Design a protein around this nucleic acid. Structure first.
Ligand SMILES: COc1c(N2C[C@@H]3CCCN[C@@H]3C2)c(F)cc2c(=O)c(C(=O)O)cn(C3CC3)c12
Ligand SMILES: COc1c(N2C[C@@H]3CCCN[C@@H]3C2)c(F)cc2c(=O)c(C(=O)O)cn(C3CC3)c12
Ligand SMILES: COc1c(N2C[C@@H]3CCCN[C@@H]3C2)c(F)cc2c(=O)c(C(=O)O)cn(C3CC3)c12
Ligand SMILES: [Mg+2]
Ligand SMILES: [Mg+2]
Ligand SMILES: [Mg+2]
Ligand SMILES: [Mg+2]
Ligand SMILES: [Mg+2]
Ligand SMILES: [Mg+2]
Ligand SMILES: [Mg+2]
Lengths: 481, 191, 481, 190
DNA sequence: GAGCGTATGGCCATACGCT
DNA sequence: GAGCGTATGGCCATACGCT
């Protein structure tokens, strides 16, 4: 058969580009995840690889996620999972790793045959209420499994851990933030829908990196929040200590986010050997675990350390910019979103999650109360019920006879037929009445939530505050005025 | 190996070359093929975008070099269709989005460096079963009976109809100008 | 502290050597498997990756087997599994593979991310009755899981698929055999314990390779069967086609077992190049899926093809020896076994598996019969049973009252209390009587098996014949006189 | 330094020590969990060549063996110099498994046949990692450090030679070319 | 200047015993 | 001889967009 070259180029390229955009490189606005991450977390959840249980071998997690949800390379899965376990990559890590999971110096993690993982306690909040019809499930690549379209995400993950992805025709670069600051901003938005970005910034001061450090001015942040795009100046934490009789040394304790420590040191070393920076006698990486990042630059006598340090900020990645480009999938399509839009979309997801949960909980409660009514009729007239069953030749006849005589439903009659003889004891009869009465009170409680949109909004606020009090931590990055 | 696996025939009119996506597919293809008239060239990883690269890089790319050596036609001004080793050059990629990407990258190289090969109707696109699984997860028996056997296979002959339109198409989709590419995506959206 | 060099050498070397011997390189005489193979098959079984169910991704099987049973490299597991799926490696393949699983040319399988597998219908016979206390289970490497010491192996797998392993201080090399021939030999041994190797050879003619071909003489086979050691001369199936104008050519249709086709061709091609062989004009690999192996060697006009072919057998792997060294793990220790010993040990395993199964089946039957007696008393006095339960305040009182009044056991009382109301219908009461009566005949039937060693031996024979009729196939390798 | 060695800052051999770790993954974490001034990591990849089975031309052509000789800077055979040594502690660090034991035997075979006065001077040591099935690779950078990298917490076994005529017979039997003597040893000692 | 992070896996050497 | 089969994985190049 025949095929036009222009048609083949347009059709094939659009197929790839759209797939990279909606199913690879860009995160969802609601849960802040790319498909690979969502598949790793759901895979951990389905396999019961929770914080309370032992670490499970990385190769088993990777193979499961691959065979069931991610039709790609084992390396691309393992590597995505590794990043989620790194306390220098993820502001609130989503994976709990055991073994070599890499360091700041750019070295990678050990091969998946040597590592072990499970989910962190915060990840349980991303998965919380997933099995309560809160989110929509879809068929997997082969059609032999089901997978989540989005996770409930009971904390604002997109803004919390940030995002960084290279698509086709576009890319994303969302910085990480402080959970306490974010949740407070979300609470302020729910109470005031016409809240300005300026007003929101009283809660959300700016990005909060896991690598800590410093941010130079609120100017860069403000632009990034109003438009979705802006450049944020990140600077290392460096101190000039007064050691010798005249001698002095620079100590780098915190480095910029996503900056490779070894590469940064190599860049400083290169300037010294090329004589592009004069004043450095020795440079050493004194970094340890209890010590943390410690890069020592010892300054030659009579040379100003303040001059050398400022020149290091300019000439090396000791000072680096963060080019904010807040692109996320909103209604399955890419969108450049501002700070408020990110929060509004997140709040809507929470409103839906909580409503859908309450609706599910109610269906189940109404269903159970119905069965309990049936069992209550049964127990009140057991001599007759037993008689009716015994007189019946088949299960079909017993089902019909019970329904017709005691005005019971198909479900109520089936529940009675499945009732064990031990339910006829004194205490077991009293338990049924106690369950029914407590259940009617729960049904009313749920019905009240769905009746008032403000009660439902208050429940979202209450649950968000609970997460803030449990997982919210101190701000790491210092924003200098 | 990872290198070219030629056919026993020396007549190019009946000889075909299958540019196979990935190592694992390349092995099964080499096993399922017609040894007499079908050659297999396994192409590893994403092919270099020639539209974005300069000549020194293009000629230094091994996978590009492997193809030039296989066809034996030459590139640019020195391309001789009379020197072609295969009258059929079959692009055989996975029935997935990345298979489509590799297909675009190969056509970009052929359009900018071996244009009279497409004009002569020597460039074809194999149509493997679109059943969610790629080429590497397929048997050697079924790879033949569905994508290689001339009795049952369906190849798409790549044709040039408007060179002015094609030039604008390769420049937009594979060029350094992101904005035009982003516009193409946001217009052609859903499809 | 200190450590002697000789002591460390002796202690450390013995630790490695014994582990390679009893837990790596040598197969178990009973099931014919090395630990890696057994772990792959048990892992398939536990995951329900049976022939009736869809193919499961290789990386998922590998990751599961690794994390749960095999504390080694993912490649070593995947590669072991691959071999089991190859119709040219395994005489009766144990793994059902989808995708590139390699070829005879030395062509490896695709990476485990591509490819998928499940067990073959014959493997179900290796796992048959595993959950009926037929075999002993052991704790895994970490102690969080249980694994089989040996599989029931309802067909003689050690001789059927053979074995090949390099240990320390020893090695094993057992050729594959015809299942119909082996089972017949096993049946002949069970009927005659003093059967000679000569007599056994009337059933077991010799090795039967999956690659077919030819064996030169019964001499090599005879020695290997009597001593467990011998050299068997394997020769390719080659024909000389007399063609027009005097001209000749040789066609190779079958090649020796474990011989690499491409390597064999390369060896012929290098002799021609190096002028070490005279008379070959052209050499071709005409092998296609439609024809199978077809290696055509063209002969020069003035040359004799019979001369060239015989020189090819001598100088290339067109003829290759099989160095039989029948070493297997017998009572957890390595042993050089002869043909009869291999069959005797296998027959004993079957005698134990069938006895252990019958013993298990009996315990369960006796247990069920007892419960049925209780339910029979319950149904016969249902009006009383119901009042007894209803009069009871707790389950504990109901349990005591039922046992004291109706002379029932703790188990019988508990079974009555767990009895659903639907068991009181006409048909459901009749089913209980029918189950009890059928069960009493099954108990007698099982008790008869354990009472007479001949009945038990006949049952083993009957079950072995069933497998022979279902899976036994035609002999592939032709043993020439 | 990606797959090769990482050396100690100290130029004095009495102060500095070399750790021959087992596997790539072990090498990386041990290079991270060390005292850079006194500790030097030489990661050994795969099973090390059995020098008792090999001829000199092959032994000298091996890159695993050549990396060690260059690291110690002692020379081999008749040209070995105990004084011309770079480290005073040569630590064999291996997995707490059967293959770990094997690598340990292969390294001692090389040291006995080529660097004998290194063992005699008590320079050769065996690191004692925790036994429980995991192995070196599976351990974290800080677990690796407090386990065997702190000569404070660490317990090293000093390799000593007591009978050279017995040791000669032992290396030739266990690591030699004659299978029958090895097979006999296994059969007897089980 | 170049590198962030999800995408498209063969090659190499060694132990061990037999022939 | 050299290679059978279970054991002890980093290196390499490419797309894509932003700064
Ligand atoms: C053989 O292709 C790859 C190369 N090669 C590309 C070049 C072309 C010819 C051969 N040599 C070089 C190296 C590479 F460098 C890395 C990776 C890689 O990391 C990877 C993965 O799953 O992570 C998968 N692949 C295969 C799926 C493509 C890689
Ligand atoms: C890096 O070690 C290995 C080599 N190297 C050994 C040499 C020494 C220095 C570097 N170059 C060469 C190649 C090799 F050739 C193959 C394998 C191998 O197949 C394998 C596996 O799991 O399948 C695992 N490993 C690692 C567990 C040992 C291999
Ligand atoms: C200042 O941004 C750029 C830098 N780097 C500076 C920073 C230093 C640390 C590590 N990298 C970042 C990026 C770079 F290395 C390369 C390019 C570059 O090639 C390029 C282009 O048009 O091809 C455009 N620009 C943008 C100015 C348009 C580049
Ligand atoms: Mg990779
Ligand atoms: Mg700077
Ligand atoms: Mg694919
Ligand atoms: Mg390997
Ligand atoms: Mg021969
Ligand atoms: Mg180990
Ligand atoms: Mg540039």
């Amino acid at each position: 058969n025949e095929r036009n070259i222009t048609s083949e180029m347009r059709e094939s390229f659009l197929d790839y580009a759209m797939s990279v955009i909606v199913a690879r490189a860009l995160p969802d606005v609601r849960d802040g995840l790319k498909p690979v991450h969502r598949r790793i977390l759901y895979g951990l959840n389905e396999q019961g690889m929770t914080p309370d249980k032992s670490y499970k071998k990385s190769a088993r997690i990777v193979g499961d996620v691959m065979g069931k949800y991610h039709p790609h390379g084992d390396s691309s899965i393992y590597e995505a999972m590794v990043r989620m376990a790194q306390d220098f990559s993820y502001r609130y890590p989503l994976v709990d790793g055991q073994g070599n999971f890499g360091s700041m110096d750019g070295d990678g993690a050990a091969a998946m045959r040597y590592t072990e993982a499970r989910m962190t306690k915060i990840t349980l909040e991303l998965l919380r209420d997933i099995n309560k019809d809160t989110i929509d499930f879809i068929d997997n690549y082969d059609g032999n499994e089901r997978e989540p379209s989005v996770l409930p995400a009971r904390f604002p993950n997109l803004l919390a851990n940030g995002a960084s992805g290279i698509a086709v025709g576009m890319a994303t670069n969302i910085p990480p933030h402080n959970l306490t600051e974010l949740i407070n901003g979300v609470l302020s938005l729910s109470k005031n829908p016409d809240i300005s970005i300026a007003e929101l910034m009283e809660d959300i001061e700016g990005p909060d990196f896991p690598t800590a450090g410093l941010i130079l001015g609120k100017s860069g942040i403000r632009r990034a929040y109003e438009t979705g795009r802006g450049s944020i100046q990140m600077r290392s934490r460096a101190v000039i200590e007064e050691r010798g009789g005249g001698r002095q040394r620079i100590v780098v304790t915190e480095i910029p986010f996503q900056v490779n420590k070894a590469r940064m040191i190599e860049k400083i070393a290169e300037l010294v050997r090329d004589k592009k920076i004069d004043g450095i006698t020795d440079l050493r990486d004194e970094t340890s675990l209890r010590t943390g990042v410690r890069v020592v630059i010892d300054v030659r006598k009579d040379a100003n350390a303040s001059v050398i340090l400022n020149n290091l900020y300019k000439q090396t990645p000791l000072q680096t910019s963060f080019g904010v480009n807040m692109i996320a999938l909103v209604n399955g399509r890419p969108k450049l979103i501002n700070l408020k839009e990110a929060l509004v979309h997140y709040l809507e997801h929470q409103k839906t999650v909580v409503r859908r949960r309450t609706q599910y909980n109610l269906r189940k409660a109404k269903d159970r109360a119905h069965i309990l009514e049936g069992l209550r009729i049964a127990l009140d007239h057991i001599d007759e019920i037993i008689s009716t069953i015994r007189e019946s030749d088949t299960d079909k006849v017993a089902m019909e006879s019970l329904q017709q005589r005691f005005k019971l439903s198909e479900k109520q009659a089936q529940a009675i037929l499945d009732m064990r003889l031990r339910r006829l004891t004194g205490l077991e009869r009293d338990k049924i009445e106690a369950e029914y009465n407590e259940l009617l009170n729960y049904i009313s409680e749920l019905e009240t939530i769905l009746a008032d949109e403000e009660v439902l909004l208050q429940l979202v606020r209450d649950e968000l505050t609970e997460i803030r009090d449990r997982f919210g931590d101190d701000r790491r990055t210092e924003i200098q005025l | 190996p990872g290198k070219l696996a030629d056919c026993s025939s020396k007549s190019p009119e009946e000889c075909e070359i299958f540019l196979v996506e990935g190592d694992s597919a390349g092995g099964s293809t080499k096993s399922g093929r017609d040894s007499r008239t079908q050659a297999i060239l396994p192409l590893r990883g994403k092919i270099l975008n020639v539209e974005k690269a300069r000549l020194d890089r293009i000629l230094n790319n091994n996978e590009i070099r492997q193809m030039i050596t296989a066809f034996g036609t030459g590139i640019g001004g020195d391309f001789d269709l009379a020197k072609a080793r295969y009258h059929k050059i079959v692009i055989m990629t996975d029935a997935d989005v990345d298979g489509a990407h590799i297909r675009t990258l190969l056509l970009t190289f052929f359009y900018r460096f071996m244009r009279p090969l497409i004009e002569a109707g020597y460039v074809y696109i194999a149509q493997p079963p679109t059943g969610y699984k790629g080429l590497g997860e397929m048997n050697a028996d079924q790879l033949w009976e569905t994508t290689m056997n001339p009795e049952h296979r369906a190849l798409l002959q790549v044709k040039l109809e408007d060179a002015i339109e094609a030039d604008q198409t390769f420049e937009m989709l594979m060029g350094d100008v992101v904005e035009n590419r982003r516009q193409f995506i946001e217009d052609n959206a859903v499809y």
